[PDB]
Every structure is written in structure tokens, then in C-alpha cells.
């Protein structure tokens, strides 16, 4: 008969796959949108860039965070699988 | 009765498929959005492309960072599946 | 159990994934390009000739990916790699 | 300061200009009213 631990490992791996799929989608989209805004703003006024970096590097950091922390969780799916016997 | 490792490998493969699916979606969309901003700006300010390229590529690199982190983790999942008995 | 059953079911589901993604991407990208074209026409009635050339440049790319996906599904559906 | 605020109504919509507003050229609506605390706005002054 099948080893249950193998089923758990497979399920956790699929879960982490979903984790990173969502994280990658979100981080890519957020970075692209924040960029688009930054590029447009600097295009309007070159010198303005000097300040527009500030909010951008917030939102980037704020979206990348939602990835990084998310990343940690999928590690918990693989490194230390909960409910794994 | 089938080998547990075969099931684990199938789970890892599906997980990595999701990994790169989400990564591709995120990278494509974010890069396209940044490119739209670059196109609009260059159309607006004709000769500002040279200076606009560097802020463009800041976001391009930022977006690709998540994609390639997901690459690293997909390789981790597939080449050496975590806890493969 | 027959290996062919599992392999063929997996191939069917994979090809279905391929077409789902291809349809989504082609439809949305083509719609966005058409939106650009419509905006141009409305803001500039006489530009229809100038804007058509970029339009097809976009479509050719977008559709190409879709058709690529189309082709790949055949490989997944008809001649499944590792079929046995 | 450009006043600390210039309210007005434009064809696009209502616009409230602050001292460091990005340059902006727009038309006022027919019944436009302007408050201070067509329209052309330059980097230094309205």
C-alpha cells in the first residue's frame, strides 16, 4: 500500500507550487505597475524623479514583502511540512 | 502499491509547473506594463529615451527578480525534490 | 491499471491547460490592441491607414503565441511524449 | 506658494493647483469659478 508520507510530500509540494505561482504573479504585476507609474512621472518632469523614487521604493518594498513573507510559508510546506508523520 | 517516490516526483513536477506558470504570467505582464510606460513616455518626450531607459530597466530587473527566484525554487523542487525518499 | 489511461488523461488535461492559457492571452491581448486602434480612430478619424500597420504587428505576435500553443496541444493530444 | 491653493473648474474637471503643480494647460468650463487661498500653469507660477 502507498506510503502516506509520500502523499503528504506531494500535496505540500503542489501547495508550495500554488504559493509561488501567486507570489510571482503578484510581485511581477505590482512591480510592473509601480514602474509604469514611475516611468510616466519622470517622463513628465525629469528632475521630478529625484522624489518619485521615494513612494515607488515604498510600494515595491511593500509588494516584494508580500512575496518574501509568502515565500517563507512555502518553505514551511517543504522544509518542515506541518501535519507530516 | 506503486512506488511512493513516483507519486512524490509527480507532485513535484506539478508544483514546478505552477511555479513557472505564475512566474511567466507575472514577468510577462509586469514587463509589458513597464514597456507601455516607456513607449508612452518616449512618444511624449521624443529624445528622453536615453535617460528613461535606466528607470525602465530598474523595474525590468525588479520584475525579473521574482521570476528567477521562482526559477531557482523550481529547480530546487524538480532537480532535488525536498525530502525525496 | 493500464498506464495508457493515466498518461492519456494527463495529456488531455495538459492540452486543455495549454488552450485555456492561449485563449486567455490571445483574446485579452488582441482586445487591448483593438482598444488602442479604436481610441486612435476616434481621436483621429483620418489615421486609419497609419494605425493599421502597428495593429497587425501586434496581432501577428499575439496570435503567433496562441497558434504555437495550438500546435503544442496537438503534440500533447495526438502524439503524447512518453506514451505507453 | 505659486497662493497656497487655486481652485477652479475645467473642461476635464475641477482642478486644485498647489504651489509645485506639474505644468498644466487646460480650458475653463463655461461657468468656471476660481478660488484662491482658460488656465495655464507653469513650474514657477500659474
Amino acid at each position: 500500500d502507498l506510503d502516506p508520507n509520500a502523499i503528504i510530500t506531494a500535496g505540500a509540494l503542489i501547495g508550495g507550487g500554488l504559493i509561488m505561482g501567486g507570489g510571482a504573479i503578484g510581485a511581477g504585476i505590482g512591480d510592473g505597475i509601480a514602474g509604469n507609474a514611475l516611468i510616466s512621472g519622470i517622463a513628465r518632469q525629469p528632475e521630478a524623479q529625484g522624489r518619485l523614487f521615494t513612494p515607488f521604493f515604498i510600494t515595491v518594498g511593500l509588494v516584494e514583502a508580500a512575496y518574501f513573507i509568502n515565500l517563507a510559508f512555502m518553505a514551511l510546506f517543504v522544509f518542515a511540512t506541518p501535519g507530516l508523520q | 502499491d506503486l512506488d511512493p517516490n513516483a507519486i512524490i516526483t509527480a507532485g513535484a513536477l506539478i508544483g514546478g509547473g505552477l511555479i513557472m506558470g505564475g512566474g511567466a504570467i507575472g514577468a510577462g505582464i509586469g514587463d509589458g506594463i513597464a514597456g507601455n510606460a516607456l513607449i508612452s513616455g518616449i512618444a511624449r518626450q521624443p529624445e528622453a529615451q536615453g535617460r528613461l531607459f535606466t528607470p525602465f530597466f530598474i523595474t525590468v530587473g525588479l520584475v525579473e527578480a521574482a521570476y528567477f527566484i521562482n526559477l531557482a525554487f523550481m529547480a530546487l523542487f524538480v532537480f532535488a525534490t525536498p525530502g525525496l525518499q | 491499471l493500464d498506464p495508457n489511461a493515466i498518461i492519456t488523461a494527463g495529456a488531455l488535461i495538459g492540452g486543455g491547460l495549454i488552450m485555456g492559457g492561449g485563449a486567455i492571452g490571445a483574446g485579452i491581448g488582441d482586445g487591448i490592441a483593438g482598444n488602442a486602434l479604436i481610441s486612435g480612430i476616434a481621436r483621429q478619424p483620418e489615421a486609419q491607414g497609419r494605425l493599421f500597420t502597428p495593429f497587425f504587428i501586434t496581432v501577428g505576435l499575439v496570435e503567433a503565441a496562441y497558434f504555437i500553443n495550438l500546435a503544442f496541444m496537438a503534440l500533447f493530444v495526438f502524439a503524447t511524449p512518453g506514451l505507453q | 506658494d505659486l497662493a497656497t491653493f487655486v481652485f477652479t473648474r475645467t473642461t476635464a474637471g475641477e482642478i486644485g493647483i498647489l504651489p509645485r503643480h506639474i505644468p498644466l494647460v487646460a480650458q475653463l468650463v463655461d461657468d468656471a469659478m476660481v478660488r484662491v487661498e482658460f488656465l495655464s500653469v507653469t513650474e514657477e507660477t500659474v
Binding site: - | - | - | T10, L24, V25, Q27
Partner: peptide, 24 residues
């Protein structure tokens, strides 16, 4: 400026209403 940024067939400046629109 606006004419230079418009079709002539009747530190950039943002033309909130469309540049062609303002001419009419």
C-alpha cells in the same frame, strides 16, 4: 506649443483636455 502638439488641419506641459479638443 499646442499647435506644435496637435494636428494642423482645423519640461512638457500636461494638456488635461485633449490638445485637439482645446482648439475647437
Amino acid at each position: 506649443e499646442l499647435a506644435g502638439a496637435s494636428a494642423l488641419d482645423h519640461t512638457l506641459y500636461s494638456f488635461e483636455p485633449d490638445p485637439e479638443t482645446l482648439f475647437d
